[PDB]
Design a binder for this molecule. Structure first.
Ligand SMILES: N#CCNC(=O)c1ccc(-c2ccnc(Nc3ccc(N4CCOCC4)cc3)n2)cc1
Length: 300
């Protein structure tokens, strides 16, 4: 009460934050490209600015937690927090982060295949694993690892780029039970997340396996996880029947197929991540080392 939490409301003043482009909309948020030009001279750093789509009270509280999460992270493969803009005369909140020019990895794989080969995919795989190792040191569970939430700085660097579903483990538990679910990315979820709403480092590893699948399908039309699972389940299914069949399929070892051209050894990594036995999934440290050894064992 007496003294409010430290914040720097003059770091990004709304009057100097200049719109450049709309970048995308999520479930609860919208992201713009802006230029922060305090010397009103048409210069300044380019930044990404996350805002809410629907500014209810509950969403604002969750957004504050997301901001605190991102601010606490400093790693080469995590999008860089810059600050907050308290716009509308300090009656609204916007999150300021660095701007990464090539957008989501999902889009980059579809739009920039000319500059992607397996070496690059393994580099991105490694970088994602290292960012996730770092999250684990903070006891953060991402809960939405997917190529749409990874951002591309350049052909040699990707970063985990969004944290809107991230949760902090309780002190005395190795899982977080989500007890207010909203929209769920079911085709990336581990079975125990689907059946018990339990999220953990190990369920992030499961989702990472799906990310690795996404990378090697090159975001090919008809090969995405939703399209492939729907083909396996039955394309005509609708509503909860989809979830029922997805759960039953996963529990009895149904899995996404090996992408065309994917090496057996990379598919093996995927299938080890997709273990119904939570404790048998590899760690992100195991995965980064294995991927970097594969890369390093190539000639050159
Ligand atoms: N709400 C919600 C879920 N999160 C986002 O939508 C989200 C989060 C972060 C960023 C972000 C952060 C830093 N840099 C960038 N760069 C970026 C560059 C290009 C594009 N696209 C280029 C192609 O057309 C569509 C936008 C998208 C983001 N994005 C974008 C969207």
């Amino acid at each position: 009460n007496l003294y409010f939490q430290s914040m720097d409301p003059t770091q990004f003043e709304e009057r100097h934050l200049k719109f450049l482009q709309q970048l995308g909309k999520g479930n609860f948020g919208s992201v713009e490209m802006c230029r922060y030009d305090p010397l009103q001279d048409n210069t300044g750093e380019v930044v990404a600015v996350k805002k809410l789509q629907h500014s209810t009270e509950e969403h604002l509280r969750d957004f504050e937690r997301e901001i605190e999460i991102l601010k606490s992270l400093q790693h080469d493969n995590i999008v860089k927090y810059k600050g907050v803009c308290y716009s509308a005369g300090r009656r609204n909140l916007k999150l300021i982060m660095e701007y990464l020019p090539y957008g989501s990895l999902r889009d980059y794989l579809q739009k920039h295949k000319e500059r992607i080969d397996h070496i690059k995919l393994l580099q991105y795989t490694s970088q994602i694993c290292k960012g996730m190792e770092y999250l684990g040191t903070k006891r953060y569970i991402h809960r939405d690892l997917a190529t749409r939430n990874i951002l591309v700085e350049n052909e040699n660097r990707v970063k985990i780029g969004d944290f809107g579903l991230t949760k902090v483990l309780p002190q005395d538990k190795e899982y977080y039970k989500v007890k207010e679910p909203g929209e769920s990315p079911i085709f990336w979820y581990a079975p125990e997340s689907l059946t018990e709403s339990k999220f953990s480092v190990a369920s992030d590893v499961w989702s990472f396996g799906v990310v690795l699948y996404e990378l090697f399908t090159y975001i090919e039309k008809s090969k995405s996880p939703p399209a492939e699972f729907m083909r396996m389940i039955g394309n005509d299914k609708q509503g909860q029947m989809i979830v029922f069949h997805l759960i039953e399929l996963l529990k009895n070892n149904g899995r996404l197929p090996r992408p065309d051209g994917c090496p057996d050894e990379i598919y093996m990594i995927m299938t080890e991540c997709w273990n119904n036995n939570v404790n048998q999934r590899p760690s992100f440290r195991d995965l980064a080392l294995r991927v970097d050894q594969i890369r390093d064992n190539m000639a050159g």
